[PDB]
Design an enzyme around this catalytic site. Structure first.
Site, PDB file in Angstrom:
ATOM      1  N   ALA B 279      87.478  26.371  22.122  1.00 38.12           N
ATOM      2  CA  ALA B 279      86.184  26.743  21.581  1.00 38.12           C
ATOM      3  C   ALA B 279      85.088  26.316  22.534  1.00 38.12           C
ATOM      4  CB  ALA B 279      85.964  26.110  20.212  1.00 38.12           C
ATOM      5  N   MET B 280      83.909  26.897  22.351  1.00 37.71           N
ATOM      6  CA  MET B 280      82.726  26.362  22.996  1.00 37.71           C
ATOM      7  C   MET B 280      81.535  26.605  22.092  1.00 37.71           C
ATOM      8  SD  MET B 280      81.144  26.719  26.818  1.00 37.71           S
ATOM      9  CE  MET B 280      79.792  25.629  27.240  1.00 37.71           C
ATOM     10  N   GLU B 281      80.586  25.677  22.135  1.00 35.26           N
ATOM     11  CA  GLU B 281      79.536  25.544  21.139  1.00 35.26           C
ATOM     12  C   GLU B 281      78.303  26.389  21.407  1.00 35.26           C
ATOM     13  OE1 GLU B 281      80.135  23.651  23.516  1.00 35.26           O
ATOM     14  OE2 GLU B 281      78.391  22.523  24.217  1.00 35.26           O
ATOM     15  N   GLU B 315      82.528  22.321  16.386  1.00 29.87           N
ATOM     16  CA  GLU B 315      81.596  23.160  17.116  1.00 29.87           C
ATOM     17  C   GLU B 315      80.291  23.327  16.371  1.00 29.87           C
ATOM     18  OE1 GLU B 315      83.262  22.482  19.555  1.00 29.87           O
ATOM     19  OE2 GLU B 315      83.218  24.440  20.533  1.00 29.87           O
ATOM     20  N   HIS B 318      78.137  20.235  17.191  1.00 25.47           N
ATOM     21  CA  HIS B 318      77.383  20.320  18.440  1.00 25.47           C
ATOM     22  C   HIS B 318      76.033  21.006  18.282  1.00 25.47           C
ATOM     23  CE1 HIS B 318      80.071  18.571  21.293  1.00 25.47           C
ATOM     24  NE2 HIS B 318      80.998  19.504  21.196  1.00 25.47           N
TER      25      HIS B 318
END
Ligand SMILES: *[C@@H]1O[C@H](CO)[C@@H](O)[C@H](O)[C@H]1NC(C)=O
Ligand SMILES: *[C@@H]1O[C@H](CO)[C@@H](O)[C@H](O)[C@H]1NC(C)=O
Ligand SMILES: *[C@@H]1O[C@H](CO)[C@@H](O)[C@H](O)[C@H]1NC(C)=O
Lengths: 142, 883, 92
Positions: B279-281, B315, B318
C-alpha cells in the site's frame, strides 16, 4: 532366530518416515544395536528404498573417511551410486573421488572406477529413451 | 565540490505553486515505447540572493526553449543535466533578485516504463483484453521523474493538477475534479480533467491515476465522501463492500483520537491488480493491492479480513500524522511509519471491537523485532541526518527496525505516560505544526508540556527518557532477585560472546518503567534509572510470587531467580486464568530466548510449555509453536524427533477434542476471530503431528470435495490445512493438479501450490521439481516459492540440495530470489557433513544471495555447537514427558 | 426492472440504471385500470443485480399489493401508475 532378525533388519528400511530412516542409520553405526557384521548391508537396504537414496548418498559422501577405517566398501559404493542417471550425479561421483582418493578406497578402489564408467552409460541411455518409454507407458496403461 | 556535486538542495529557493499536465499515451509507439507529454510551471521565491537554478530532474527528455530546456529576472546562461545527481542546473547570467516570485517553466516527455517508479504503467488481463492503467509510485525518490520539482519532503507547496486521457477513461488525483471532464478541442478522442488546488503538501505524496476502474461510494456522517475503486468485474461481485463498511467508523475514530477533523474533502481508496508494496498513503488517494483491499466472503479466510482492516487502518492513519505534519528529513522516517504501525492496531480495534486485535501487536511486532535487534549488527533508530543523502541511503531506512521498534517504543511511551496525556500531547502537536515540517524533538517538547500541565510524575524529562531509547541500539534484560527484591539490567545480546562494535554514549544503560503484578493483583508502577536498584516492592516470602512487564507494554526481557520461576509455574498450572493472557505468551517466549543465550537451562523453557495442556487462548499456543519450530527444524531428521512428536500430541489432544464438541463436528466456525485462529492451530498441529482423528476427518472432507468439484464443502478458513494434510495421505494429487491448472483464483492457486508440496511420494515431488522449470506449468516469478515449499518438506530437503548443486550455474546465469532460497535450503544444516558440502559448493563456484551464503555458514557453526550442547538433555526431557 | 450503473466510471450503487416499470394493460390514455369482474388477483414480477433489491411500499393505502389477494372484499377497486391512495416502489 537369525533369519527373522535379518528379515526385520531389511523390512525396517522400507519405512517412509525419513526420521525413522535416519535414526535407523544412527543405530546402524552403533555396534551394540546392530553388529559390525551387517551394518553395511543394512545401509544398502536403506539405499534400496528410494527415500533412503538421499540419506545414504549424503551420509557416505560426507563421512566416508570414518567408514574407511572400519565399516565392504565395494558393493556399498555400487549400491549407493547405481541410481545415478545425470551428469550432475557424475560430477558428484568424480568430486567424491577427488575428495577422498588421497586416502584411496580399499576394496572399493576399483569399484568406484567401474561406477564412474557405468553412470556415464546410464546418462546417455536415459537421453536415448525417456520420451519413447514414457509414450509407451502413457498409452498402454490406459 | 560544487552544489551539483552535492546531494542536497540549497535552502535558497522555496517553491510556492505548481502546475502539471500529463498525457499518458497508453498505446505503444512505433518503437514500442509508451510515452507521455508533460508540461509544468513552478513559482518559486528566492530565499537568498543567487544566480543559478538547481532543480531535480531525472530520465526526462526535455524540449529546448530559447535554446535551453527552460524559460525563466535576469537571463539564463546555460542549462545542463548533471545525471549523477539528477539536477537540472541552469546558470543565470544575472543574479536572481531575492524576495521575488518567478516562474520556471518547461515542457518535456517521459517513458511509462512498468518499473514501479514514477509515473509507471501497469498492465493486466481483463476478460481477454490486456488492459493498461497509468498510475503513480512516488516513494521518496521518484516524484521528480514525472515532472521537474524541488523534490524534498521539507519543500512543501501547492499543486494544481490537470490530466488529459483517452475519452473512455477516468482520471483521479488527490483533490476532487474541478468541474466535469471535457473533450479536448485538439482531439475529442481525448478528455481533459482539472482538479482543485491541493493544500500545502510535499511532492512525495502526489498521485495521478488514469484508469477504467469503477467505484462504490458512501457519504460519511462527517460529510466526507468515501469511495472504493476497483475493477468493475470485481466490484460487481461486491468485493469492495467490506472496505466501504469499515472505512467510515475508522475515520471517525481517528477524528476523535487526534481531536482533529479529517482535513481533505474526499477519501478515495483504489485497489490495483498488481503493486510492489502492499500500500501507499498518497494523500487522499490511498492505493492498495487487490488482495489487501478487496474481500470475498466466499473464498477469503478470516485472516484476510484482519489483513484488510489492519492495512486500511494504517494507511488511513497516515492521512493525519505524516501527511498533515510531515517529517523534516528522511532520518526521522521511523517516527512516521512506526507510529502509524502502532495506531493501526488501535484503529482496527474501533472497527471490530470484538476481536481484541490490540493483543497481536505483541506477536507480530514486538517479538518479531526483538529477535532482530538482539544482535550486535543492529543499529539505533535516530541516525544523524547527514548520514542519509543518496537514494540508496534513503531507501535503506524502510526496514523491520524502523517500523516495529518505532511501534514498540511509542507504545511504551503511551504506557508510562497516561494514555490520555499522550492524546493531549499528540493533538497539541498536530494543532501547532499542521502543514509544517518538524523533527521528533518538537514532539517531545509538546509531550513534556502536556505532562507538566497534567503534572504527571516522572523521574526526569521525557526528552531524556526517549533519547535513552531512541539513539542507542539493543534493549535490556531485567533481572530480579526476589529473595531481596534486588534489581538489575543488562544489554541482552543473543550471542553472549558477540563483540559489540558500536559504542553507547550511555554504555547501554536504560531507564525502564516496570509495571508489575503480585499473586494476581496489580502492584504500583516502579521506575529503574540505574544499572541496579533495590525495592521491597519486589521482595517475596512463602508462596508469594511476582510477575513483571504486565501486558508486555515495556520493551525489555525479564528474568527471575529459579525459585520464582518455580512459583510462577505452580501458580500457572494451578489456575492460569489468574495471569493475563498476553503474559502467558510472554513468559514462554522469554524462557526460550533466554535459553538460547545460555542465561537459563532449556529445561526451564520446556517446563514453561507444560501448562498448555489446558490453555485455550490463541496467543500462548502461537508463541509455543513459534519457538518449538526451531526444535523441529533442527531435530526433524534426528532420533529426538521421535519422542517430541508424541509429546505435542499429549499437549494438543484435549484441545482438539474441545473444538470437536464446540464446532458440532466442524459444521460451523467460531464467531470470534481469535477462536478461529486457535481452531486452525489446533487442527493443524494435532493433525500434522498425527492424531488418529485427522486421518479420518480431513480425508473425509477432501473426498467429499472430490465428490463435489464445483461445490467445495471445506470452509475457506480451514482450506489450507486440510488440503495439505489430505495430500499427505496419486489420485488426490492429480486431482489437485488438474484443479491447479484449472484454478482461476490466485488465492486458491497458491493454497494448492503449497498443499501439493505436502505429498509423501518422492516421485511426486521430483515431478513437481521438474515442473518448476516449465514456464507454462508455473509462472516463472513463483517457481522459487514452489522450491521453498518442497524444501521445507523433510523428504525434499536432500532432493532440493542436490538439485541446486546440479542447477546452480544455470539458474544463476539465467533464472528470482537466490537469497531466501539459500536460506530455506541451508537452515536444516547442523553437522560438519553439510558444512563441508556447503563450503565445497562455495569453492566450486552468487548474486544477491552471496552474503546469505555467508549467513548460512555462520549459523550452521552455531547450530553445530548448539545440538552438541543440548541433544541429550532435550531428549531426556522429552522422553520423560513422553508418557 | 432496473440495473446498476456500470461500465468503468460509475457508481455501482448511487442510483439504479435502466429503470422500467409497467402495469399490465394499463393504458394511460384510458385512465385507471378498474377491477370490474367479481374477482381479481394481484401479481408482482421482478425483472432486475448483486445486492440490489426492490419492493413495493404500502404508501398511504390501508392495504398492500399482494396482500389484497387474501380475500379482502370491496365495493370497488381501480389501479393506476398515475394518481386514490399511493404506494411507492423502493429500490434498495
Ligand atoms: C469524456 O469524453 C466524452 C466525449 O467523448 C464527454 O462527453 C465526457 O463528458 C468525458 N468524460 C467522461 C467521464 O466520459
Ligand atoms: C457492515 O457491517 C455490519 C456489522 O455491524 C453489518 O451489520 C452490515 O450488514 C455490514 N454491511 C453493510 C452494507 O452495512
Ligand atoms: C491488559 O490487557 C488486557 C487485554 O488483553 C486488558 O483487558 C487489560 O485491561 C490490560 N490491563 C492493563 C493493566 O494494561
Amino acid at each position: 532366530l537369525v533369519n527373522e532378525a535379518d528379515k526385520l533388519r531389511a523390512a525396517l528400511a522400507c519405512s517412509k518416515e525419513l526420521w525413522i530412516l535416519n535414526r535407523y542409520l544412527s543405530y546402524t553405526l552403533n555396534p551394540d544395536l546392530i553388529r559390525k557384521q551387517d551394518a553395511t548391508s543394512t545401509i544398502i537396504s536403506i539405499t534400496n528404498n528410494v527415500i533412503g537414496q538421499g540419506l545414504v548418498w549424503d551420509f557416505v559422501q560426507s563421512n566416508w573417511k570414518k567408514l574407511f577405517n572400519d565399516y565392504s566398501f565395494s558393493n556399498l559404493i555400487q549400491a549407493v551410486t547405481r541410481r545415478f542417471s545425470t551428469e550432475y550425479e557424475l560430477q558428484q561421483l568424480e568430486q567424491f573421488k577427488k575428495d577422498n582418493e588421497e586416502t584411496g578406497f580399499g576394496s572399493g578402489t576399483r569399484a568406484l572406477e567401474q561406477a564412474l564408467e557405468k553412470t556415464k552409460a546410464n546418462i546417455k541411455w536415459v537421453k536415448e529413451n525417456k520420451e519413447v518409454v514414457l509414450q509407451w507407458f502413457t498409452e498402454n496403461s490406459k | 565540490s560544487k552544489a551539483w556535486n552535492r546531494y542536497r538542495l540549497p535552502n535558497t529557493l522555496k517553491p510556492d505553486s505548481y502546475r502539471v499536465t500529463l498525457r499518458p499515451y497508453l498505446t505503444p509507439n512505433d518503437r514500442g515505447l509508451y510515452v507521455f507529454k508533460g508540461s509544468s510551471t513552478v513559482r518559486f521565491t528566492c530565499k537568498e540572493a543567487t544566480d543559478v537554478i538547481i532543480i531535480h530532474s531525472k530520465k526526462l527528455n526535455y524540449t529546448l526553449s530559447q535554446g535551453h530546456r527552460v524559460v525563466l529576472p535576469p537571463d539564463i546562461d546555460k542549462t545542463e543535466l548533471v545525471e549523477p545527481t539528477e539536477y537540472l542546473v541552469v546558470h543565470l547570467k544575472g543574479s536572481l533578485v531575492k524576495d521575488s516570485q518567478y516562474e520556471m517553466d518547461s515542457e518535456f516527455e517521459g517513458e511509462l516504463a512498468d518499473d514501479l517508479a514514477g509515473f509507471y504503467r501497469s498492465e493486466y488481463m481483463e476478460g481477454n483484453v490486456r488492459k493498461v492503467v497509468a498510475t503513480t509510485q512516488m516513494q521518496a525518490a521518484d516524484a521528480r521523474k514525472s515532472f521537474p520539482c524541488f523534490d524534498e519532503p521539507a519543500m512543501k507547496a501547492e499543486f494544481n493538477i490537470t490530466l488529459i486521457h483517452p475519452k473512455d477513461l477516468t482520471a483521479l488525483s488527490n483533490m476532487l475534479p474541478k468541474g466535469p471532464s471535457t473533450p479536448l478541442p485538439e482531439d475529442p478522442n481525448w478528455n481533459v480533467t482539472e482538479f482543485h488546488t491541493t493544500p500545502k503538501m510535499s511532492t512525495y505524496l502526489l498521485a495521478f491515476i488514469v484508469s477504467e476502474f469503477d467505484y462504490v461510494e458512501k457519504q460519511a456522517s462527517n460529510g466526507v465522501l468515501i469511495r472504493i475503486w476497483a475493477r468493475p468485474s470485481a466490484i460487481a461481485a461486491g468485493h469492495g463492500d467490506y472496505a466501504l463498511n469499515v472505512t467510515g467508523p475508522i475515520l471517525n475514530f481517528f477524528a476523535g483520537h487526534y481531536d482533529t477533523p479529517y482535513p481533505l474533502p474526499k477519501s478515495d481508496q483504489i485497489g490495483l491488480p498488481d503493486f510492489n508494496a502492499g500500500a501507499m498513503e498518497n494523500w487522499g488517494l490511498v492505493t492498495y493491492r487487490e488482495n489487501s483491499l478487496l474481500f470475498d466472503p466466499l473464498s477469503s479466510s478470516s485472516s484476510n479480513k484482519e489483513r484488510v482492516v489492519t492495512v486500511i487502518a494504517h494507511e488511513l492513519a497516515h492521512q493525519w500524522f505524516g501527511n498533515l505534519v510531515t517529517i523534516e528529513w528522511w532520518n526521522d522516517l521511523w517516527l512516521n511509519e512506526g507510529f502509524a504501525s502502532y495506531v493501526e492496531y488501535l484503529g482496527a480495534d474501533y472497527a471490530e471491537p470484538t476481536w481484541n486485535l490490540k493483543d497481536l501487536m505483541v506477536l507480530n511486532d514486538v517479538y518479531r523485532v526483538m529477535a532482530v535487534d538482539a544482535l550486535a549488527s543492529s543499529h539505533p533508530l535516530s541516525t544523524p541526518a547527514s548520514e542519509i543523502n543518496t537514494p540508496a541511503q534513503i531507501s535503506e531506512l524502510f526496514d523491520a527496525i524502523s517500523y516495529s521498534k518505532g511501534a514498540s517504543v511509542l507504545r511504551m511511551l503511551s504506557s508510562f505516560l497516561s494514555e490520555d496525556v499522550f492524546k493531549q500531547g499528540l493533538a497539541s502537536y498536530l494543532h501547532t505544526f499542521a502543514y509544517q515540517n518538524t523533527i521528533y524533538l518538537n514532539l517531545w517538547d509538546h509531550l513534556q508540556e502536556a505532562v507538566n500541565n497534567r503534572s504527571i510524575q516522572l523521574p526526569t524529562t521525557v526528552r531524556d527518557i526517549m533519547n535513552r531509547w531512541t539513539l542507542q541500539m539493543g534493549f535490556p534484560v531485567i533481572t530480579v532477585d526476589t529473595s531481596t527484591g534486588t534489581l538489575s539490567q543488562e544489554h541482552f545480546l543473543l550471542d553472549p560472546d558477540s563483540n559489540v562494535t558500536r559504542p553507547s554514549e550511555f554504555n547501554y544503560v536504560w531507564i525502564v518503567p516496570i509495571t508489575s503484578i503480585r499473586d494476581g493483583r496489580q502492584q504500583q508502577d516502579y521506575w529503574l534509572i540505574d544499572v541496579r536498584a533495590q525495592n521491597d516492592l519486589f521482595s517475596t516470602s512463602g508462596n508469594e510470587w511476582v510477575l513483571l512487564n504486565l501486558n508486555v507494554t515495556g520493551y525489555y526481557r525479564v528474568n527471575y531467580d529459579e525459585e520464582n520461576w518455580r512459583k510462577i509455574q505452580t501458580q500457572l498450572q494451578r489456575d492460569h486464568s489468574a495471569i493475563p493472557v498476553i503474559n502467558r505468551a510472554q513468559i514462554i517466549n522469554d524462557a526460550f530466548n533466554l535459553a538460547s543465550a545460555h542465561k537459563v537451562p532449556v529445561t526451564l523453557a520446556l517446563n514453561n510449555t507444560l501448562f498448555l495442556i489446558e490453555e485455550r487462548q490463541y496467543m500462548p499456543w502461537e508463541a509455543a509453536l513459534s519457538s518449538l519450530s526451531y526444535f523441529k527444524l533442527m531435530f526433524d531428521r534426528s532420533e529426538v524427533y521421535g519422542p517430541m512428536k508424541n509429546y505435542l500430541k499429549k499437549q494438543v489432544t484435549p484441545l482438539f477434542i474441545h473444538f470437536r464438541n464446540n464446532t458440532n463436528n466442524w459444521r460451523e466456525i467460531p464467531e470470534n476471530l481469535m477462536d478461529q485462529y486457535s481452531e486452525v492451530n489446533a487442527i493443524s498441529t494435532a493433525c500434522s503431528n498425527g492424531v488418529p482423528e485427522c486421518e479420518e476427518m480431513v480425508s473425509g472432507l477432501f473426498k467429499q470435495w472430490m465428490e463435489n468439484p464445483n461445490n467445495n464443502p471445506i470452509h475457506p478458513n480451514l482450506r489450507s490445512t486440510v488440503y495439505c494434510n489430505a495430500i499427505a495421505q496419486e489420485e488426490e494429487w492429480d486431482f489437485a493438479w488438474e484443479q491447479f491448472r484449472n484454478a482461476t483464483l490466485v488465492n486458491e492457486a497458491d493454497k494448492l501450490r503449497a498443499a501439493l508440496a505436502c505429498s509423501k511420494e518422492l516421485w511426486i515431488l521430483n515431478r513437481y521439481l521438474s515442473y518448476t522449470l516449465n514456464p507454462d506449468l508455473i509462472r516463472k516469478q513463483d517457481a522459487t516459492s514452489t522450491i521453498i515449499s518442497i524444501t521445507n518438506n523433510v523428504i525434499g530437503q536432500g532432493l532440493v540440495w542436490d538439485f541446486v548443486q546440479s542447477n546452480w550455474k544455470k539458474l544463476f546465469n539465467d533464472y528470482f530470489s537466490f537469497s531466501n532460497l539459500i536460506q530455506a535450503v541451508t537452515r536444516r544444516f547442523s553437522t560438519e557433513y553439510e558444512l563441508q558440502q556447503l563450503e565445497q559448493f562455495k569453492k566450486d563456484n552468487f548474486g544477491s544471495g552471496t552474503r546469505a551464503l555467508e549467513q548460512a555458514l555462520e549459523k550452521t557453526k552455531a547450530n553445530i555447537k548448539w545440538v552438541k550442547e543440548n541433544k541429550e538433555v532435550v531428549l531426556q526431557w522429552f522422553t520423560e514427558n513422553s508418557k | 426492472d432496473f440495473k446498476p450503473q456500470s461500465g468503468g466510471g460509475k457508481c455501482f450503487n448511487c442510483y439504479p440504471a435502466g429503470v422500467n416499470i409497467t402495469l399490465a394493460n394499463f393504458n394511460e390514455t384510458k385512465g385507471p385500470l378498474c377491477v370490474d369482474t367479481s374477482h381479481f388477483t394481484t401479481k408482482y414480477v421482478a425483472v432486475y443485480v448483486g445486492r440490489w433489491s426492490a419492493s413495493i411500499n404500502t404508501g398511504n393505502c390501508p392495504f398492500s399489493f399482494g396482500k389484497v389477494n387474501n380475500f379482502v372484499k370491496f365495493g370497488s377497486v381501480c389501479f393506476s401508475l398515475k394518481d386514490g391512495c399511493a404506494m411507492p416502489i423502493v429500490a434498495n
